[PDB]
Amino acid sequence: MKKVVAVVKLQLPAGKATPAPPVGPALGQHGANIMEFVKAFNAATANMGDAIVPVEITIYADRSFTFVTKTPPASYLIRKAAGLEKGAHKPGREKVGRITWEQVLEIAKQKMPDLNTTDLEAAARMIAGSARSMGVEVVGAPEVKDA
């Protein structure tokens, strides 16, 4: 028994997971608990939705699998900072989706723990611009003449 003894470096599909992974035995022999493995996975990938995520299941001989990923594209925290209850629907004049500049920033800041990004303006345009993709507006974005 020592520090990290097995690292499962590979891709994994959010949700759409099952007792039939490429590892299975290569992971089961550990003795741990498969269902537990998948549970925490599926359970988190389910809490976030089905998708694809690169992971390196850091397994320590003490029989412990360290590994957690999340932070969906936008709706992740946008859902709150925005204000989407039921969701999208037929066109309407109600107009919804208003996030503030600082809020999208902080949300666009911790968004890159070690990603190839450090420019606020980039991550900003991402969360914001992405919002534009989705269908939201930012209360902060000067670019219109007053006359």
Query: The tokens of 26 are what?
Result: 């290569």
- Report the distance separating Cα 137 and Cα 126, nearest Å: 13
Instruction: Residue count of the chain, please give it.
Output: 147
- Look up the CATH number of the domain holding residue 43: 3.30.1550.10
Residues 92 and 102 in one domain: yes
Residues 44 and 12 in one domain: yes
Q: Coil, strand or helix: which one is 90?
A: coil
C-alpha count within 13 angstroms, C-beta hemisphere, residue 116: 0
Q: How many structural domains compose the chain? A: 2
| Closest to 11 in 3D by CA, of 40, 63, 54, 42 | 54
Q: Coil, strand or helix: which one is 36?
A: helix
User: What count of other Cβ atoms lies within 10 Å of the Cβ of residue 118?
Assistant: 9
Contacts of 36 (CB under 8 A, 6+ apart): none
User: What count of other Cβ atoms lies within 10 Å of the Cβ of residue 99?
Assistant: 23
Among 20, 49, 70, identify where a domain stops.
Answer: 70
Residues 7 and 37 in one domain: yes
Write out the residue range of the structural domain in which residue 5 sits: 1-70
Experimental method: NMR
Q: What are phi and psi of 144, to 5 degrees?
A: -135, 135
Q: What are phi and psi of 16, to 5 degrees?
A: 40, 25
- Report the distance separating Cα 87 and Cα 39, nearest Å: 28
Residues 10 and 51 in one domain: yes
Q: Are 8 and 59 in contact (CB under 8 A)?
A: yes
